[PDB]
């Protein structure tokens, strides 16, 4: 319902947010795209999800030595100010292909909140063309944060998302 | 700037709000409409503003015995759940006339935050037809709150505003 949706988003946007809680388990974001922390990445070969890809956004190249997973490494510095905007289109195009091929992919960083959360937020914004960008940003942000406990908490990352995906009509 | 505006509103809406601070001084909201607490109402006859009206939303009828001010009394119960929506159109039509006649009016309650703040928020929403209601609600709410320190903190009042002024396009 529009009335329930607007009440939810605007109360969340004017003072009613939960304290941030560190996510521990993997979240299915779309049909094939998943969001997680570093433990979730270590557990990916053992997951019932038949992951074809893991997108590793940490600084460290790792291997999953007994796994057929293709680990794509895009190192993002562990900083509250990382230039993630340079990677938005490359990452969302990759995630869109995974959804188009039904090739499950886990996007992760260390805590599964900021670097990986921001790329998931970018992907969802890029997949939207029905809802106004402002409304959709507030909906995705608050509903993902309620689900995960913490989601793109870094103000610089939110700012970069806003500047990329919310300034233009869509 | 659209980019600066969206950054401001959406960062305020996703976790970056100040602690609530009780307002002490009167705020000029429009050309003729002012917002204040109970002390501001007591001080209204002495104000350099030549108030023609005071809108008293407290439960108590008072007089300003050495003053030509017309005190309009609409008692609103001191409750977090008061049905303010019944009074929206009556109050905003009255405030709109004060602006049309250049007849200054002070809207006040006890703390100048919730009952009076909500009627000011309703009035500003009713005066808007250019900006989308969602965007304008977030702009007025956060900018008034930053100015006053506390502004429509009661969730029931925000909900009633949202249901009245934000659900429809405008």
Author numbering:
A (entry chain A), B (entry chain A): 2 to 171
The publication says:
Poxviruses express a dual specific phosphatase (H1) that de-phosphorylates signal transducer and activator of transcription 1 (STAT1) and blocks interferon signal transduction. Due to the importance of H1 in modulating interferon-signaling and viral replication, it serves as an attractive anti-poxvirus drug target.
Two H1 molecules are related by crystallographic symmetry and form a domain swapped dimer, which resembles a butterfly. The overall structure is composed of six α helices and four β strands. The first hot spot is the dimer interface, which is unique among the members in the protein tyrosine phosphatase (PTP)/dual-specificity phosphatase (DSP) family.
